[PDB]
Design an enzyme around this catalytic site. Structure first.
Site, mmCIF file in Angstrom:
data_model
loop_
_atom_site.group_PDB
_atom_site.id
_atom_site.type_symbol
_atom_site.label_atom_id
_atom_site.label_comp_id
_atom_site.label_asym_id
_atom_site.label_seq_id
_atom_site.Cartn_x
_atom_site.Cartn_y
_atom_site.Cartn_z
ATOM 1 N N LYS A 42 -2.152 2.923 4.276
ATOM 2 C CA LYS A 42 -1.785 1.772 5.200
ATOM 3 C C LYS A 42 -0.948 0.802 4.443
ATOM 4 O O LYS A 42 -0.992 -0.200 4.725
ATOM 5 C CB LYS A 42 -3.069 1.104 5.980
ATOM 6 C CG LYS A 42 -3.871 2.183 6.111
ATOM 7 C CD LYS A 42 -3.419 3.308 7.260
ATOM 8 C CE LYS A 42 -2.871 2.901 8.767
ATOM 9 N NZ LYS A 42 -2.246 3.870 9.506
ATOM 10 N N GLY A 44 2.787 1.293 4.424
ATOM 11 C CA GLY A 44 4.036 1.552 4.859
ATOM 12 C C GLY A 44 4.652 2.699 4.556
ATOM 13 O O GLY A 44 5.793 2.940 4.729
ATOM 14 N N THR A 45 3.840 3.871 4.247
ATOM 15 C CA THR A 45 4.224 5.045 4.093
ATOM 16 C C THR A 45 5.205 5.608 4.957
ATOM 17 O O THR A 45 6.144 6.254 4.785
ATOM 18 C CB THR A 45 3.110 6.074 3.709
ATOM 19 O OG1 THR A 45 1.841 5.442 3.342
ATOM 20 C CG2 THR A 45 3.386 7.230 3.079
ATOM 21 N N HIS A 95 -1.419 10.186 -1.194
ATOM 22 C CA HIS A 95 -2.197 8.902 -1.173
ATOM 23 C C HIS A 95 -2.974 9.109 -2.718
ATOM 24 O O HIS A 95 -3.876 8.140 -2.888
ATOM 25 C CB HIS A 95 -3.073 8.890 -0.448
ATOM 26 C CG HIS A 95 -2.425 8.396 1.061
ATOM 27 N ND1 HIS A 95 -1.407 7.611 1.132
ATOM 28 C CD2 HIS A 95 -2.698 9.129 2.333
ATOM 29 C CE1 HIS A 95 -1.140 7.490 2.596
ATOM 30 N NE2 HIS A 95 -1.780 8.263 3.158
ATOM 31 N N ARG A 117 1.494 -2.923 -0.907
ATOM 32 C CA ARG A 117 1.432 -4.112 0.129
ATOM 33 C C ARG A 117 0.218 -4.815 -0.105
ATOM 34 O O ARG A 117 -0.686 -4.697 -0.912
ATOM 35 C CB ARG A 117 1.178 -3.582 1.703
ATOM 36 C CG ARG A 117 1.018 -4.534 2.857
ATOM 37 C CD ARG A 117 0.876 -3.759 4.113
ATOM 38 N NE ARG A 117 0.986 -4.347 5.363
ATOM 39 C CZ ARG A 117 0.900 -4.085 6.507
ATOM 40 N NH1 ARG A 117 0.274 -2.998 6.814
ATOM 41 N NH2 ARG A 117 0.859 -4.849 7.746
ATOM 42 N N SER A 125 -5.337 -3.461 8.309
ATOM 43 C CA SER A 125 -4.781 -2.120 8.699
ATOM 44 C C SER A 125 -5.723 -0.936 8.514
ATOM 45 O O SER A 125 -5.697 0.069 9.463
ATOM 46 C CB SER A 125 -3.536 -1.905 7.935
ATOM 47 O OG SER A 125 -2.654 -0.850 8.533
ATOM 48 N N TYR A 180 6.024 -3.513 0.255
ATOM 49 C CA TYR A 180 6.151 -3.659 1.813
ATOM 50 C C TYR A 180 6.885 -5.232 2.105
ATOM 51 O O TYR A 180 7.527 -5.279 3.048
ATOM 52 C CB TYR A 180 4.695 -3.589 2.478
ATOM 53 C CG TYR A 180 4.889 -3.805 3.952
ATOM 54 C CD1 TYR A 180 4.463 -5.025 4.589
ATOM 55 C CD2 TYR A 180 4.676 -2.755 4.734
ATOM 56 C CE1 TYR A 180 4.460 -5.268 5.883
ATOM 57 C CE2 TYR A 180 4.648 -2.887 6.300
ATOM 58 C CZ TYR A 180 4.422 -4.051 6.622
ATOM 59 O OH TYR A 180 4.391 -4.115 8.139
HETATM 60 N N1 LIG Z 1 9.114 0.081 10.611
HETATM 61 C C1 LIG Z 1 8.090 -0.456 10.446
HETATM 62 N N2 LIG Z 1 8.065 -1.816 10.102
HETATM 63 C C2 LIG Z 1 6.969 -2.546 9.829
HETATM 64 N N3 LIG Z 1 5.737 -2.179 9.733
HETATM 65 C C3 LIG Z 1 5.832 -0.761 9.779
HETATM 66 C C4 LIG Z 1 6.560 0.277 10.262
HETATM 67 N N4 LIG Z 1 6.247 1.360 10.517
HETATM 68 C C5 LIG Z 1 4.926 1.514 10.152
HETATM 69 N N5 LIG Z 1 4.591 0.065 10.037
HETATM 70 C C6 LIG Z 1 3.251 -0.478 9.857
HETATM 71 O O1 LIG Z 1 2.700 0.325 8.474
HETATM 72 C C7 LIG Z 1 1.377 0.353 8.524
HETATM 73 C C8 LIG Z 1 0.815 1.943 8.498
HETATM 74 O O2 LIG Z 1 1.152 2.433 7.252
HETATM 75 P P1 LIG Z 1 0.937 3.903 6.613
HETATM 76 O O3 LIG Z 1 2.130 4.692 7.345
HETATM 77 O O4 LIG Z 1 1.050 3.808 5.249
HETATM 78 O O5 LIG Z 1 -0.010 4.583 7.318
HETATM 79 C C9 LIG Z 1 1.108 -0.172 9.902
HETATM 80 O O6 LIG Z 1 0.589 -1.748 9.658
HETATM 81 P P2 LIG Z 1 -0.337 -2.870 10.685
HETATM 82 O O7 LIG Z 1 -1.628 -1.862 10.933
HETATM 83 O O8 LIG Z 1 -0.587 -3.767 10.046
HETATM 84 O O9 LIG Z 1 0.378 -2.891 11.907
HETATM 85 C C10 LIG Z 1 2.157 -0.222 10.729
HETATM 86 O O10 LIG Z 1 2.349 -1.087 12.003
HETATM 87 C C1 LIG Z 2 -6.539 15.554 8.775
HETATM 88 C C2 LIG Z 2 -6.748 14.161 9.801
HETATM 89 C C3 LIG Z 2 -5.725 13.858 10.665
HETATM 90 C C4 LIG Z 2 -4.786 12.997 9.867
HETATM 91 C C5 LIG Z 2 -5.422 11.933 9.229
HETATM 92 C C6 LIG Z 2 -4.451 10.926 8.376
HETATM 93 C C7 LIG Z 2 -2.955 11.030 8.646
HETATM 94 C C8 LIG Z 2 -1.957 10.221 7.956
HETATM 95 C C9 LIG Z 2 -2.701 9.751 6.730
HETATM 96 O O1 LIG Z 2 -1.585 8.619 6.074
HETATM 97 C C10 LIG Z 2 -3.752 9.410 6.423
HETATM 98 C C11 LIG Z 2 -4.754 10.382 7.127
HETATM 99 C C12 LIG Z 2 -6.230 10.374 6.665
HETATM 100 C C13 LIG Z 2 -7.307 11.213 7.407
HETATM 101 C C14 LIG Z 2 -6.694 12.300 8.299
HETATM 102 C C15 LIG Z 2 -7.381 13.334 9.052
HETATM 103 C C16 LIG Z 2 -8.807 13.644 8.720
HETATM 104 C C17 LIG Z 2 -9.302 14.728 9.822
HETATM 105 C C18 LIG Z 2 -8.220 14.912 10.661
HETATM 106 O O2 LIG Z 2 -8.059 16.280 10.958
#
Ligand SMILES: Nc1ncnc2c1ncn2[C@@H]1O[C@H](COP(=O)(O)O)[C@@H](OP(=O)(O)O)[C@H]1O
Ligand SMILES: C[C@]12CC[C@@H]3c4ccc(O)cc4CC[C@H]3[C@@H]1CC[C@@H]2O
Ligand SMILES: Nc1ncnc2c1ncn2[C@@H]1O[C@H](COP(=O)(O)O)[C@@H](OP(=O)(O)O)[C@H]1O
Ligand SMILES: C[C@]12CC[C@@H]3c4ccc(O)cc4CC[C@H]3[C@@H]1CC[C@@H]2O
Lengths: 280, 281
Positions: A42, A44-45, A95, A117, A125, A180
């Site tokens: 979470k 910004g991947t 990750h 971040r 998040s 981020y």
């Molecule tokens: N283009 C963008 N600009 C800003 N934030 C972004 C973005 N695309 C994704 N995000 C934010 O990145 C987070 C997801 O991160 P990841 O990709 O590592 O799973 C979320 O944060 P929030 O939950 O705070 O909104 C999401 O809204």
């Molecule tokens: C692979 C799954 C969907 C994708 C999910 C995801 C998707 C994106 C990410 O950055 C992390 C995770 C963690 C948990 C994952 C889940 C565990 C069960 C599910 O099938």
């Protein structure tokens, strides 16, 4: 139960489905031109993944274009298999902390990009992400989740150890370290920096296109990047959407005062001797 | 809601996830040596699929070895994509009636195998399957499910129209028609027949290896065929297992007398002029 789903593996709490066949990850064969994008969950991947893909290219789901290395759910989902069938140059998502990454990547001296971040915003998040994932037990409350976060008892372990170890690796000129909040406050600068690290010519046309296509509003409505291509039975966005808010400072709407003081105090003790520069 | 999940497509009730991108199925490109295994749901598809695979290999999850053609769930599951990346000779699984199958298969005169099972036993197996699938609304009762079955208002439509249309197609020497109850009562005969249709030698060693590997007891314990390789979030076997009973006659434990009479009467009117030979039981 929480601990029926997650278990410690070499000092890091992990989803058991990702460690059942660990041998496939440990023996993974890297290629010299592979690029690794690493992050703590979470941070910004998805955002930086799309920026880099666009650079490579001057529809298919993002999790298909850029495979998630260690992701595995028996025979339905397998990131390693996807990568073996992927044509070069491959972009690899992960990750994992440095001690768990396949050694072949270090051995072959592959380029890597690490993004982080601020910790309080990551916790907000991550809390919603657990609610979104159907097979992950919902935390009883935000505070209860934060106590676990401070202990490193959440999937992928301690955020503190994750950032500190990757910061040390970034001493290498081939490992880029980014934030981020820097992408939020000065996007043009960060994009030019990425284009240069990947050895390409930063032109006004290319830089503008990327800035335009990768805004939060743009990505929230693009089915390829908003995760709607992934079944609701696995990730229920009716509970909470993937592109949630995309801002800096949402911790102000979740952390009570007492909790914030304890967290910040704990942070200090943990990050004392680390030189990393987060944005004010 | 039931009809939010399922919708009629060209006269056949279908899971909307399988018709959203119908163009991908209609335009599918077949190869001369492709083999099609077609069935109405819950008639023994998994059983005969493993027998045929063994024949090809002369003595990985089954849904990976033999792709399910029209199965689709956005970008997570895509049978068409799997087939485009599959090396020949390909084995293709499908539950479609003749009028919905990609025309390329008929144009290339591909060999096909169709398997059926008695209607009452199919209804029992299908009822439990709806309970198993998490995104499918659970029927309020077995009787309510049977009323829908008689009307053809279940996924893949009318069982009656499905069997009658495929029976007509079996006039072709390249389309083999078989029965679940014949495999149950005379497996050795059915296995030898399949080996010959696929142009191979039915040696004693081969036939015996297949019979032992494909028994209900074996397949129930084989993780490759018992669908435990598919996430519980999609198919919850805690509710009902895939390898349930594997017998002939479970309808006797579900159909009240009044219902059975009405069903059998309805069957008569639907199948009056069909020459298909089901086994006496
Ligand atoms: N283009 C963008 N600009 C800003 N934030 C972004 C973005 N695309 C994704 N995000 C934010 O990145 C987070 C997801 O991160 P990841 O990709 O590592 O799973 C979320 O944060 P929030 O939950 O705070 O909104 C999401 O809204
Ligand atoms: C692979 C799954 C969907 C994708 C999910 C995801 C998707 C994106 C990410 O950055 C992390 C995770 C963690 C948990 C994952 C889940 C565990 C069960 C599910 O099938
Ligand atoms: N080797 C085998 N022998 C007998 N029946 C088998 C079998 N393998 C699977 N089955 C049965 O075939 C049905 C599933 O069909 P399909 O593969 O088309 O979905 C189930 O019927 P029951 O629910 O009556 O037990 C299952 O038990
Ligand atoms: C594709 C799904 C899993 C596999 C299921 C299946 C699996 C095998 C089969 O012969 C028929 C069906 C029908 C419903 C399918 C399900 C619909 C939702 C789920 O994701």
């Amino acid at each position: 139960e929480y601990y029926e789903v997650f278990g410690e593996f070499r000092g890091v709490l992990m989803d058991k489905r990702f460690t059942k066949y660990w041998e496939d990850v440990e023996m993974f064969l890297a290629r010299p031109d592979d690029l690794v994008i690493a992050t703590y969950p979470k941070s910004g991947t998805t955002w930086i993944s799309e920026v880099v893909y666009m650079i490579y290219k001057e529809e298919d789901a993002i999790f298909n274009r850029i495979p998630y290395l260690e992701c595995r759910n028996e025979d339905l989902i397998n990131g390693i298999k996807q990568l073996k069938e992927k044509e070069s140059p491959r972009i690899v998502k992960t990750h994992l902390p440095p001690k768990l990454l396949p050694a072949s990547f270090w051995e072959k001296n592959c380029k890597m990009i690490y993004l982080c971040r601020n910790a309080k915003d990551v916790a907000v998040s991550y809390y919603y992400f657990l609610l979104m994932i159907t097979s992950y037990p919902n935390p009883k409350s935000f505070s209860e989740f934060v106590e676990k976060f401070m202990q490193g008892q959440v999937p992928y372990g301690s955020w503190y150890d994750h950032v500190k170890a990757w910061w040390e690796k970034s001493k290498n000129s081939r490992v880029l370290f980014m934030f981020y909040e820097d992408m939020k406050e000065d996007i043009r600068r960060e994009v030019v920096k990425l284009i240069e690290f990947l050895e390409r010519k930063p032109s006004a046309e290319l830089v503008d296109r990327i800035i335009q296509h990768t805004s939060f509003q743009e990505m929230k409505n693009n089915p390829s990047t908003n995760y709607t291509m992934m079944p609701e039975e696995m990730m229920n966005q009716k509970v909470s959407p993937f592109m949630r808010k995309g801002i800096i400072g949402d911790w102000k709407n979740h952390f009570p005062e007492a909790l914030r003081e304890r967290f910040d105090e704990h942070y200090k003790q943990q990050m004392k001797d680390c030189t990393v520069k987060f944005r004010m």
